[model samples]
Target: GTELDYDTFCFYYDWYGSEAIDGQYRHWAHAIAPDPNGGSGQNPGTIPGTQESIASNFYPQLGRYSSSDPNILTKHMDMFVMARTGVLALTWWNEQDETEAKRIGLILDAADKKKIKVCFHLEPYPSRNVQNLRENIVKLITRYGNHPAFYRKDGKPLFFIYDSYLIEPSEWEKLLSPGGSITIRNTAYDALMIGLWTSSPTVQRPFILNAHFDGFYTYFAATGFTYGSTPTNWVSMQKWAKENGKIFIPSVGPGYIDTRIRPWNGSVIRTRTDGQYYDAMYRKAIEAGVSAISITSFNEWHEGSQIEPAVPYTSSEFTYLDYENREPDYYLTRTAYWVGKFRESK
Candidate 1:
């Protein structure tokens, strides 16, 4: 059994590629929202000055596969297990999305045979609130708890609530705190709730103390997203978290280039530096002696931060990173190498 003094969880995004023609599949093909540049949206086959085409960023190796495919799920888990991953923090939208529901079922089924742990990364939906979150948590536990692949720590399921700051800490207290309405303190829904850290010490500190959150994690791989995401802040944040009895999970990534998605945000690109960036981040976490860490993503092609295999691509409009003339599996093998170091560091 590959147990450890630390755990490494990879953030998995299942929101891309669609087999259904329900308009949600390959949703990245359309720039639905306005970018910081205030440009109008563009559709597939058209490239605006502000936004690039989604087709421009395709991984030449995988060539736009559907996320709903079972073989893809198996291959993904194989890579995760090969990299010594302890858990895959899956991005889940809500309870009603049938596509996501089916995808999750397939993931759990695939992960079970692979012996990989699966946890939830709860995304912020439009009307998300304490009550709805409580209900969702109950549903998740009741439906998935029996699965041997569902990740558990201390007999409690682990959930990473992304954009958790959308709800006020006062409201989160109702469900998280011991003495509030719908409290999970001593109920069947009791579990480990990890909230996102958005660099506001004012907000983060209160949520930890009042909301009864188990810990916090930085979800962004880019440095400028927030002060907490800066690699330099890890040691300091880890110290603070340890003092307050909180788990601090820092996220690292190969790089970030989401021009295809956020057009105006091209200025924030973080170079992969031929994988040095990921190495440095892992080194920082190791030196900080943090008990757990998170990888930004497995496959988020729209943002170009995927660690999944990619082939060098160059279209007339844009170019995408591959193994830099190396094998397509370079990133995959690199991930396994770092996973080994992270384990040995302790």
Candidate 2:
């Protein structure tokens, strides 16, 4: 069994970033705050003829990535991905329209070079429509299915479906029926797992078993979702998967609580969430015994679930110092501690 590991989806804006609504500048909460005086305030992060702090902090001098340079398929986010030697799954299919295809190219390049594993997202929230999902999956595979980064124990593309329960009952079968098509790179997807979201034997397990997927990615057993106990839900899931001849990649999150920007009523930010707390959670999860550990995210900023950077502000307000706007800097020391520990343990 692989030792406890670190994992993250090295990409942008969705449940992870600030404001998932349509027609917004999509600010990186890990980097910049919404610009005070910008175009109609609708485009908070990007404003023409205006200099934002986050854009300035864009370290294009980084290696292999540096989207600013645009030499390879790596997204402008390689710095974030390469920093930690954990598993990186690219986020595909967002509401941003054409950006998904471009993201696929970058992910494929990374997989080709063995920089990271390619994980496709079953996106467009509240994913109940099976037909649309099947259609999108077909398109997704046709475009980038041949990439070698997809999950494969004995060389097979493992499908990590997000929001596993969101799809209709027949969705998996519908998507998998067309076998041996060039879209699949001459082989059907043999494994399946839900990337995130809660699940039960009734809702989640059936999807994987029924689809003939040999593995599953459980929800984070830590991170305050369930009872804080000695043996977490992940341990139970791992046992179940192993006994049943399935590969279980257990999930772990440092800590998460922030209802600030969500539509519902909640706190403006996570009051006590800190780097120390994250490292502690990492240690506890590693102790629990699992090889594949999925981090909640590399950058989930808006809801205050961000492990990237803790911005200096009051009530989500932005502040400037030294006659310059402040850029958000992640508690990187905390990140390094966990990564070092992960490598050491591995």
Candidate 3:
């Protein structure tokens, strides 16, 4: 029953692993191509039919490890503990996704040992509605609510509902708001549900007010991707949240580049600037007086926003983003430094 305050949580994705566990074309290896054009980002190459259509601009230090691998999960949890990150908002497609279910079981156990908390990043699965969510909440609470690793705020479970706008605000109110139809306001399944705010200021305010979300979070790390992600808007956004009596979780990432993921879309790319980007975002979030900061990702390789360690990898097929002039754990070290500063401010 310990309370959480001024917390840091990283968006964790467990959809990547080995073929044996996740089947072919389902793991990270299958999603990544070897960059046929070589080191330089020239000459877009063809992806194999058996493989996924995308690859990462950067390679992970862990290469491609099995999500079910206890060793890797333990090591990942250790990294977060050292970074002062309190939670892992694990991505979950749905209750029926068996692969993720298995991963979640392992994650909770690993996180519990490290004193790290685990929360749900409820993905936008098909036909997801208030009715289904009510059932999902009950299932979630019934199954994992008793676990020490499960994150709770003010005795209720915490869930970050990704793409909460996919269902209309009116529809969400039925379950999220107290007076709406089929309300969960006073029920045992009621929770602290945080909605996602992608870009528009107009959309953000209305969604938070209408949908009856406890708070709104900016999930993108690409600074220019949306008004919420822009560092300059954070102060104003936080002010709005306070005035409206809502929580604001500012998300920050090391950098962003997903050309490999979407070759046709070449408009967005935020360089790392050797850790300066992340530092600035952290500083701004601290200045904005936010309750928590959610890191865009710990290992979303295709988008290249991961803060996990990356070694310099080069092969005949492709080249990876290496520390180059720096060490393999450069970003990890930088994260510790900034997290220390963040905690001091808190």
Q: What is the C-alpha RMSD of each candidate to the true structure, in Å?
A: 3.4, 8.3, 4.8
Ranking by lDDT: 3, 1, 2
Question: lDDT tens string, model 1, 169-274?
Answer: 8898899888988898889889888888887677677767777788888878777679778878888888888998888888888788776666667777888877
**Clashing pairs in model 2, backbone N/Cα/C closer than 3 A:** 67-76, 308-330, 309-330
Reference-based lDDT, residue 139, model 3: 88
Show the lowest summed lDDT stretch of 10 residues, model 3.
Answer: 45-54
If scored against the real structure, what TM-score would every candidate get? 0.90, 0.62, 0.89
The residue-level lDDT of candidate 3 at 114 comes to: 81
lDDT of 2: 0.44
- Model 2 agreement with the true structure over 256-337: per-residue lDDT tens digits: 4433223232322223343545566667656655555555554443333444443342222323111113233343335455
Question: Compared to the true structure, candidate 1 yields what TM-score?
Answer: 0.90
Whole-model lDDT values for every prediction = 0.76, 0.44, 0.78
Which portions of model 2 show Cα errors greater than 4 Å? 1-24, 27-78, 94-97, 106-114, 124-132, 147-153, 168-186, 189-191, 195-213, 218-222, 226-231, 263-273, 310-346
Question: 1 or 2: which has the higher lDDT?
Answer: 1
* Sliding window of 10 residues with minimal summed lDDT for model 1: 44-53
